[PDB]
Amino acid sequence: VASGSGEPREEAGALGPAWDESQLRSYSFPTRPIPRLSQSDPRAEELIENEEPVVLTDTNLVYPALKWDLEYLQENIGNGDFSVYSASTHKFLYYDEKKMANFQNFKPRSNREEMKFHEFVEKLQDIQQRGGEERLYLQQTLNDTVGRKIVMDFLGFNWNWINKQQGKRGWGQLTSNLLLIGMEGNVTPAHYEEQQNFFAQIKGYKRCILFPPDQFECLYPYPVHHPCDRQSQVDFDNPDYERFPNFQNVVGYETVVGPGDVLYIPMYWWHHIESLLNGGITITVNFWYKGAPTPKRIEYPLKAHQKVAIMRNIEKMLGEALGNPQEVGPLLNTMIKGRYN
Amino acid sequence: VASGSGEPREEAGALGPAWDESQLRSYSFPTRPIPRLSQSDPRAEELIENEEPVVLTDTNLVYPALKWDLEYLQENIGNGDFSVYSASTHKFLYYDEKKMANFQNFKPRSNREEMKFHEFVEKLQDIQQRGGEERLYLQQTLNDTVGRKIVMDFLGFNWNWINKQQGKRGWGQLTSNLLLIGMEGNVTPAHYEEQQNFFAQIKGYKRCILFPPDQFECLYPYPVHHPCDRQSQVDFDNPDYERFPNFQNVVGYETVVGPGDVLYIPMYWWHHIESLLNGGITITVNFWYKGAPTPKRIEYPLKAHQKVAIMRNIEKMLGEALGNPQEVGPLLNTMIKGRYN
Ligand SMILES: O=C(O)CCC(=O)C(=O)O
Ligand SMILES: O=C(O)CCC(=O)C(=O)O
Numbered sequence: 001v002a003s004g005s006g007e008p009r010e011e012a013g014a015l016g017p018a019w020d021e022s023q024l025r026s027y028s029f030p031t032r033p034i035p036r037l038s039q040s041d042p043r044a045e046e047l048i049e050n051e052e053p054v055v056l057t058d059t060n061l062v063y064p065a066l067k068w069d070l071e072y073l074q075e076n077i078g079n080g081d082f083s084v085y086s087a088s089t090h091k092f093l094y095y096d097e098k099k100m101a102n103f104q105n106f107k108p109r110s111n112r113e114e115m116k117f118h119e120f121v122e123k124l125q126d127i128q129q130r131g132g133e134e135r136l137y138l139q140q141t142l143n144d145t146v147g148r149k150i151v152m153d154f155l156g157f158n159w160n161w162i163n164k165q166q167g168k169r170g171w172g173q174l175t176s177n178l179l180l181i182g183m184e185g186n187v188t189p190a191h192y193e194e195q196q197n198f199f200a201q202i203k204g205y206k207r208c209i210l211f212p213p214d215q216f217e218c219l220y221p222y223p224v225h226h227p228c229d230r231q232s233q234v235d236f237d238n239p240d241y242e243r244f245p246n247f248q249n250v251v252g253y254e255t256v257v258g259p260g261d262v263l264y265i266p267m268y269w270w271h272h273i274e275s276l277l278n279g280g281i282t283i284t285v286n287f288w289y290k291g292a293p294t295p296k297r298i299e300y301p302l303k304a305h306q307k308v309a310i311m312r313n314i315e316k317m318l319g320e321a322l323g324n325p326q327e328v329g330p331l332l333n334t335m336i337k338g339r340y341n
Numbered sequence: 342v343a344s345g346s347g348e349p350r351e352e353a354g355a356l357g358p359a360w361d362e363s364q365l366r367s368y369s370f371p372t373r374p375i376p377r378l379s380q381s382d383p384r385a386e387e388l389i390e391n392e393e394p395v396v397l398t399d400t401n402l403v404y405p406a407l408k409w410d411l412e413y414l415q416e417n418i419g420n421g422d423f424s425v426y427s428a429s430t431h432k433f434l435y436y437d438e439k440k441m442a443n444f445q446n447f448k449p450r451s452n453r454e455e456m457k458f459h460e461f462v463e464k465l466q467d468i469q470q471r472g473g474e475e476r477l478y479l480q481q482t483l484n485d486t487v488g489r490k491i492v493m494d495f496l497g498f499n500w501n502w503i504n505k506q507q508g509k510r511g512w513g514q515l516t517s518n519l520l521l522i523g524m525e526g527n528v529t530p531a532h533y534e535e536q537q538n539f540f541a542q543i544k545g546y547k548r549c550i551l552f553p554p555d556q557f558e559c560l561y562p563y564p565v566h567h568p569c570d571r572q573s574q575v576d577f578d579n580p581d582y583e584r585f586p587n588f589q590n591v592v593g594y595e596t597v598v599g600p601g602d603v604l605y606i607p608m609y610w611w612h613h614i615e616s617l618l619n620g621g622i623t624i625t626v627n628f629w630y631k632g633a634p635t636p637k638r639i640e641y642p643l644k645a646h647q648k649v650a651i652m653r654n655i656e657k658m659l660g661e662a663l664g665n666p667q668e669v670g671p672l673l674n675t676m677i678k679g680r681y682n
């Protein structure tokens with residue numbers, strides 16, 4: 001019951017296992033599977049209602065994007081600019097650029113490079129043609145600049161289903177759809193979002209490991225003013241148990257998504273996302289929504305995400321009040337040592 | 342220059358030393374003297390302006406109370422009720438009774454007993470008449486119930502001088518005058534107030550050891566929701582250097598006040614106050630004032646007292662937001678461990 005993603009699934013038409021376990025990276029912690037359910041299944045509505053993750057196998061959320069692949073996209077996506085992240089390791093740590101002002105003892109290991117889609121397909125082409133070690137990850141918000149066919153594709157997504165979802169959950173407005181295109185083996189390490197997320201897998205296979213918000217103590221997010229806010233400081237490949245002792249208690253929910261699957265990633269759930277090894281390129285489109293309004297007014301006992309939201313707001317104000325985010329830590333220490341520990 | 346209170350002072354009319362060093366308790370930390378100045382001395386106005394302590398030797402702030410002693414007071418103070426604190430040790434730790442609700446794993450070592458002045462003089466009389474170990478400390482806000490002569494005494498205090506002080510400093514309104522009557526050897530252990538304080542010594546001799554607000558890290562105040570809020574957790578007689586390691590770095594300002602001296606105790610300065618051993622009873626009246634309005638608006642770098650005020654407000658809100666003061670500590674810990682330490 002520390003199973004993981006379970007035995008792989010059998011493709012339709014006897015096409016053999018979609019993937020196998022040697023495509024999965026190995027970690028220090030155990031996992032239990034996220035349930036794969038039909039969208040008509042009351043249990044799946046239960047999970048989303050309760051803000052627990054679920055993999056919906058038949059939404060058709062992005063049915064028209066299933067034909068997408070690089071040739072189609074290059075052909076049809078337009079000449080807009082695309083954010084492409086670079087890296088020498090498999091782990092793409094994200095940096096918030098606005099936050100980089102107030103941390104100088106920071107340098108990147110992943111640079112954003114703006115480029116046209118064909119330049120991406122191309123940069124992508126040079127690297128394989130020469131066996132390079134390097135890696136790229138395109139991640140760009142879909143918007144109005146995109147070509148006529150992609151727009152027809154987009155309009156054909158299952159808005160009726162996801163709008164009913166937005167409605168039933170009291171969510172706010174859709175903030176963005178991000179288009180993600182990755183190389184095999186790319187990892188987006190563990191982090192959380194403040195939005196609700198339907199994560200709609202289009203091409204290839206991604207393993208998604210989620211941790212609930214009550215595992216905050218085991219995952220050690222960066223300081224809120226740090227550029228890696230909301231990301232774990234823990235290197236999942238080489239965990240430093242002396243700095244991060246509660247990582248030894250972390251327990252995850254795990255699944256592998258393929259073409260057609262939608263993974264509900266609930267607000268504040270940590271997620272770690274890796275494109276299978278030797279699985280080829282992956283494509284995904286996500287759907288971020290604001291999140292229902294905080295109830296006027298509060299009921300106890302608070303949920304884990306609400307305690308998180310509180311920690312963030314304390315860090316933020318202290319940032320403002322002290323005039324400088326760098327003084328947040330010494331102040332907090334002074335506040336607890338010999339007082340609350 | 343770790344001098345302390347200096348060589349004792351010589352009473353007028355060759356009456357020999359007012360007190361001597363064997364009347365002073367001994368502690369683990371060093372001290373430098375607080376300056377004793379005349380009220381007309383520009384340097385004394387400098388210190389108060391800068392919120393540094395100073396002992397003013399000639400204010401006449403409470404000239405008419407200098408004749409006070411127990412017989413006079415019993416005779417003249419009326420039949421109102423007087424708060425009298427009790428104790429088996431020399432250290433009178435104060436408890437805030439409103440706060441006792443939310444800490445049950447608390448019992449007192451100092452009970453407030455309401456009683457008439459003559460009952461105090463009397464309880465006081467039984468104990469000496471029989472050589473008891475016990476101790477009392479009367480501490481009661483002067484108010485309208487007091488007898489005609491005490492009121493004449495009070496009206497004769499030097500309002501012209503202290504009102505000019507209130508005015509020059511932009512202080513708010515006088516909140517209370519507390520009347521303190523102690524037995525020789527009584528200690529009010531280290532704590533801070535949020536008000537400004539002119540501490541006006543009337544009978545006997547008190548040693549006052551002050552620490553500036555920037556020594557917060559060395560003095561380990563109780564949690565703000567604890568009943569001993571604003572008091573040091575450190576036992577000055579037996580300091581626990583394992584829980585309170587920064588106590589080994591504490592440095593104090595020290596003085597001995599006698600009849601006629603006024604000690605300015607600035608807002609947020611820690612003070613520890615002991616009535617000299619074998620010095621007899623002490624009498625003091627203080628004058629608490631609100632404190633100038635926080636500037637609209639803030640200028641950096643912040644002063645130590647302002648960082649303190651911030652720590653308090655964080656603890657308070659977290660108290661409110663979590664629904665329970667008991668959860669403040671675990672939350673703060675979760676926030677810093679592996680994150681800010
Ligand atoms: O696919 C990825 O690697 C990133 C996905 C993600 O973090 C998200 O959709 O919130
Ligand atoms: O005289 C004492 O022991 C207490 C005085 C004091 O703490 C004050 O006036 O703020």
Ligand SMILES: [Fe+2]
Pocket residue numbers: 191192193271
């Ligand atoms: Fe994410």
Ligand SMILES: [Fe+2]
Pocket residue numbers: 532533534612
């Ligand atoms: Fe005090």
